[PDB]
Enzyme design. Structure first.
Site, mmCIF file in Angstrom:
data_model
loop_
_atom_site.group_PDB
_atom_site.id
_atom_site.type_symbol
_atom_site.label_atom_id
_atom_site.label_comp_id
_atom_site.label_asym_id
_atom_site.label_seq_id
_atom_site.Cartn_x
_atom_site.Cartn_y
_atom_site.Cartn_z
ATOM 1 N N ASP A 31 -6.711 1.287 -8.388
ATOM 2 C CA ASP A 31 -5.464 1.113 -9.124
ATOM 3 C C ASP A 31 -5.717 1.325 -10.618
ATOM 4 O O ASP A 31 -6.809 1.054 -11.115
ATOM 5 C CB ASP A 31 -4.896 -0.289 -8.898
ATOM 6 C CG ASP A 31 -3.416 -0.378 -9.227
ATOM 7 O OD1 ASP A 31 -2.988 0.147 -10.277
ATOM 8 O OD2 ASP A 31 -2.675 -0.982 -8.433
ATOM 9 N N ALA A 58 0.572 2.547 -2.759
ATOM 10 C CA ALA A 58 0.696 2.813 -4.183
ATOM 11 C C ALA A 58 1.963 3.574 -4.532
ATOM 12 O O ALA A 58 2.870 3.017 -5.150
ATOM 13 C CB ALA A 58 -0.530 3.585 -4.665
ATOM 14 N N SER A 59 2.026 4.844 -4.135
ATOM 15 C CA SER A 59 3.189 5.678 -4.422
ATOM 16 C C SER A 59 3.108 6.985 -3.641
ATOM 17 O O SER A 59 2.068 7.299 -3.065
ATOM 18 C CB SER A 59 3.247 5.990 -5.922
ATOM 19 O OG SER A 59 2.172 6.826 -6.298
ATOM 20 N N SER A 81 3.694 5.072 1.693
ATOM 21 C CA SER A 81 4.587 5.911 0.899
ATOM 22 C C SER A 81 4.846 7.238 1.618
ATOM 23 O O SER A 81 4.658 8.324 1.063
ATOM 24 C CB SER A 81 3.975 6.142 -0.488
ATOM 25 O OG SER A 81 3.724 4.893 -1.123
ATOM 26 N N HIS A 189 18.313 -2.713 6.652
ATOM 27 C CA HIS A 189 18.223 -1.369 7.222
ATOM 28 C C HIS A 189 18.847 -1.408 8.616
ATOM 29 O O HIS A 189 18.524 -2.280 9.419
ATOM 30 C CB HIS A 189 16.763 -0.908 7.334
ATOM 31 C CG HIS A 189 16.068 -0.746 6.017
ATOM 32 N ND1 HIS A 189 16.444 0.198 5.086
ATOM 33 C CD2 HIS A 189 15.025 -1.416 5.471
ATOM 34 C CE1 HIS A 189 15.665 0.103 4.024
ATOM 35 N NE2 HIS A 189 14.795 -0.869 4.230
ATOM 36 N N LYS A 214 12.037 -4.558 -4.619
ATOM 37 C CA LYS A 214 12.399 -3.291 -4.002
ATOM 38 C C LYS A 214 11.710 -3.124 -2.647
ATOM 39 O O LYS A 214 12.215 -2.438 -1.765
ATOM 40 C CB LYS A 214 12.017 -2.141 -4.933
ATOM 41 C CG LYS A 214 12.719 -2.194 -6.283
ATOM 42 C CD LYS A 214 12.489 -0.924 -7.078
ATOM 43 C CE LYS A 214 13.379 -0.881 -8.309
ATOM 44 N NZ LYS A 214 13.242 0.406 -9.046
HETATM 45 N N1 LIG Z 1 7.242 2.873 4.472
HETATM 46 C C1 LIG Z 1 7.856 1.721 4.091
HETATM 47 O O1 LIG Z 1 8.758 1.014 4.971
HETATM 48 C C2 LIG Z 1 7.679 1.128 2.725
HETATM 49 C C3 LIG Z 1 8.335 -0.086 2.366
HETATM 50 C C4 LIG Z 1 8.098 -0.609 1.126
HETATM 51 C C5 LIG Z 1 7.261 0.042 0.182
HETATM 52 N N2 LIG Z 1 6.647 1.236 0.514
HETATM 53 C C6 LIG Z 1 5.777 1.990 -0.406
HETATM 54 O O2 LIG Z 1 4.601 1.297 -0.837
HETATM 55 C C7 LIG Z 1 4.600 1.327 -2.279
HETATM 56 C C8 LIG Z 1 5.300 0.117 -2.819
HETATM 57 O O3 LIG Z 1 4.394 -0.755 -2.941
HETATM 58 P P1 LIG Z 1 4.514 -2.098 -3.774
HETATM 59 O O4 LIG Z 1 5.747 -2.848 -3.463
HETATM 60 O O5 LIG Z 1 3.116 -2.498 -3.535
HETATM 61 O O6 LIG Z 1 4.649 -1.282 -5.216
HETATM 62 P P2 LIG Z 1 4.033 -1.864 -6.591
HETATM 63 O O7 LIG Z 1 4.819 -1.016 -7.589
HETATM 64 O O8 LIG Z 1 4.253 -3.292 -6.658
HETATM 65 O O9 LIG Z 1 2.501 -1.535 -6.653
HETATM 66 C C9 LIG Z 1 2.026 -0.217 -6.611
HETATM 67 C C10 LIG Z 1 0.631 -0.216 -7.253
HETATM 68 O O10 LIG Z 1 0.155 1.084 -7.069
HETATM 69 C C11 LIG Z 1 -0.381 1.601 -8.309
HETATM 70 N N3 LIG Z 1 -0.410 3.105 -8.247
HETATM 71 C C12 LIG Z 1 0.612 3.981 -8.091
HETATM 72 N N4 LIG Z 1 0.101 5.193 -7.978
HETATM 73 C C13 LIG Z 1 -1.211 5.137 -8.096
HETATM 74 C C14 LIG Z 1 -2.145 6.095 -8.080
HETATM 75 N N5 LIG Z 1 -1.814 7.383 -7.931
HETATM 76 N N6 LIG Z 1 -3.404 5.696 -8.174
HETATM 77 C C15 LIG Z 1 -3.746 4.384 -8.337
HETATM 78 N N7 LIG Z 1 -2.813 3.387 -8.305
HETATM 79 C C16 LIG Z 1 -1.548 3.803 -8.234
HETATM 80 C C17 LIG Z 1 0.481 0.970 -9.404
HETATM 81 O O11 LIG Z 1 -0.352 0.908 -10.595
HETATM 82 C C18 LIG Z 1 0.853 -0.396 -8.799
HETATM 83 O O12 LIG Z 1 -0.036 -1.380 -9.244
HETATM 84 C C19 LIG Z 1 5.696 2.243 -2.794
HETATM 85 O O13 LIG Z 1 5.243 3.491 -3.175
HETATM 86 C C20 LIG Z 1 6.582 2.439 -1.638
HETATM 87 O O14 LIG Z 1 6.736 3.836 -1.673
HETATM 88 C C21 LIG Z 1 6.884 1.756 1.761
#
Ligand SMILES: NC(=O)c1ccc[n+]([C@@H]2O[C@H](COP(=O)([O-])OP(=O)(O)OC[C@H]3O[C@@H](n4cnc5c(N)ncnc54)[C@H](O)[C@@H]3O)[C@@H](O)[C@H]2O)c1
Ligand SMILES: NC(=O)c1ccc[n+]([C@@H]2O[C@H](COP(=O)([O-])OP(=O)(O)OC[C@H]3O[C@@H](n4cnc5c(N)ncnc54)[C@H](O)[C@@H]3O)[C@@H](O)[C@H]2O)c1
EC number: 1.4.1.21
Lengths: 236, 236
Positions: A31, A58-59, A81, A189, A214
């Site tokens: 991270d 992460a994203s 993601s 959902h 979110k």
């Molecule tokens: N498939 C699903 O049903 C579902 C549901 C909820 C969330 N999600 C996904 O999971 C992630 C959401 O997670 P959260 O609630 O933990 O989000 P968050 O924003 O709380 O945490 C994400 C962490 O990832 C880090 N990050 C982003 N891109 C990075 C990269 N390229 N390299 C290193 N670190 C990186 C950020 O610094 C942050 O600390 C979101 O991207 C969302 O797309 C998916």
């Protein structure tokens, strides 16, 4: 089992404790922000550690930036993601890599349930629609935010709507999506599916995670299902 | 990929054909009755044939009789007659065999959906109820036929209601069950789940298989999800 975590946000923080609490060993946590004993800042440091599986929380961009490197490194990937795969070309490239490396990419069931039945009947699905209702504050507006196909939604809503992407991959159809902003405290959902197999309706009312409203708490939990399935005899 | 099929009835006949139209190869088919080019009558004949996985679509007794031997032969097993696992001791021994052999037993989602979300949030489930509505004829009458736990349901309905056993396995709870006989021509399953993760409702209106009206077409399809996942790099 050795597990590497990519993303130390709401889901990552939860998973880090869950792993330590359930006898798992954390290989490394990747991270750009945050602190932890196993924290690293770059994918190269991350991939130097040996690990049985890597979890992406992460994203969408992280998936696009790291997925292939992780698989080529001989590590299987659990993806959250999934919206990253809305890009067909990338998805194909990732499937191509798995073919040659013998690696696997696991799609976390995320914030919904029923992916099992949907994928089971994909060949016979004639209609599938997703309706999402979440707190308006993020959209800064209430009401119907979007109504159309999942592919179109992915265009106007990057780094979000992973559920729509997962449903599209599972069903093999371009799922109809309706996003609604409301005065709700939960992430809702609802999925309707019809086909030669019959019909099924799924409704999930998710409690949001404190660290990131979110994200549905169930989404973090969905990763533990996969981790447990890798470690145990009976797989569900 | 080579697949061994145990049980050549409504589901097995469907799967034999599905396998061959989808790039898979039939290693062998085990059934005490019926005819097919690769049909065998005993488990020993079955296990002499090379296969990557074995599919059980026969009966609960078949799981009890064959399970341990199959895993011991180095072959993973997909199970449909999950009601066999109501036998807590058998379940224990099966888990025990899986540990040593490192083999897997895949629990088919069968005629329902949501096992993914349920297992995911299993640690946070406070309530889970299954409501099943089936054609009344087999019961000799209409109306509420049974209300109680899944364990007692398994006792009053041997060789039936595997969906209740599957839900119990996934949730780790002895699911509440309510069975109703109606004029309906298909099995309708409704699942209610509530806990710290939030709430989930699943309703599936199935379509009976022609070869066996008591079986939901979706149950046959549920096996194709596991086979496809085993063969694919991308796991849904
Ligand atoms: N498939 C699903 O049903 C579902 C549901 C909820 C969330 N999600 C996904 O999971 C992630 C959401 O997670 P959260 O609630 O933990 O989000 P968050 O924003 O709380 O945490 C994400 C962490 O990832 C880090 N990050 C982003 N891109 C990075 C990269 N390229 N390299 C290193 N670190 C990186 C950020 O610094 C942050 O600390 C979101 O991207 C969302 O797309 C998916
Ligand atoms: N998990 C679920 O949602 C679900 C749904 C429907 C059916 N099922 C299970 O799958 C099986 C029913 O499937 P169907 O509709 O294919 O049934 P079916 O009666 O049409 O076929 C079953 C076949 O299995 C053979 N068989 C049974 N026990 C055997 C044994 N010990 N050795 C060799 N052959 C054996 C029978 O002779 C028969 O030909 C049932 O056991 C039911 O318990 C599960």
């Amino acid at each position: 089992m050795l597990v590497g975590l990519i993303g130390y946000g709401a889901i990552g923080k939860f998973l880090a404790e869950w792993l330590e609490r359930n006898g798992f060993e954390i290989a490394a946590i990747l991270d750009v922000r945050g602190e932890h004993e196993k924290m690293v800042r770059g994918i190269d440091e991350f991939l130097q550690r040996e690990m049985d599986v890597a979890v992406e929380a992460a994203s969408q961009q992280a998936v696009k930036d790291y997925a292939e490197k992780i698989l080529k490194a001989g590590i299987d990937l659990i993806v959250l993601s999934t919206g990253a795969f809305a890009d067909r070309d990338f998805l194909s490239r990732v499937r191509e890599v798995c073919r040659k490396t013998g690696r696997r990419v696991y799609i976390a069931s995320g914030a919904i349930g029923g992916l099992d039945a949907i994928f089971s009947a994909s060949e016979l699905i004639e209609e599938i629609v997703l309706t999402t209702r979440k707190n308006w504050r993020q959209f800064g507006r209430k009401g119907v935010i979007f109504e159309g196909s999942a592919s179109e939604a992915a265009q106007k809503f990057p780094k979000n709507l992973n559920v729509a992407a997962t449903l599209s991959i599972a069903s093999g159809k371009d799922v109809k999506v309706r996003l609604v902003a409301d005065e709700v405290e939960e992430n809702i959902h609802e999925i309707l599916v019809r086909g030669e197999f019959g019909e099924m309706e799924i409704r999930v009312r998710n409690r949001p995670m404190r660290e990131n409203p979110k994200t549905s708490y169930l989404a973090a939990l969905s990763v533990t299902r996969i981790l447990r399935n890798l470690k145990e005899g009976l797989v569900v």
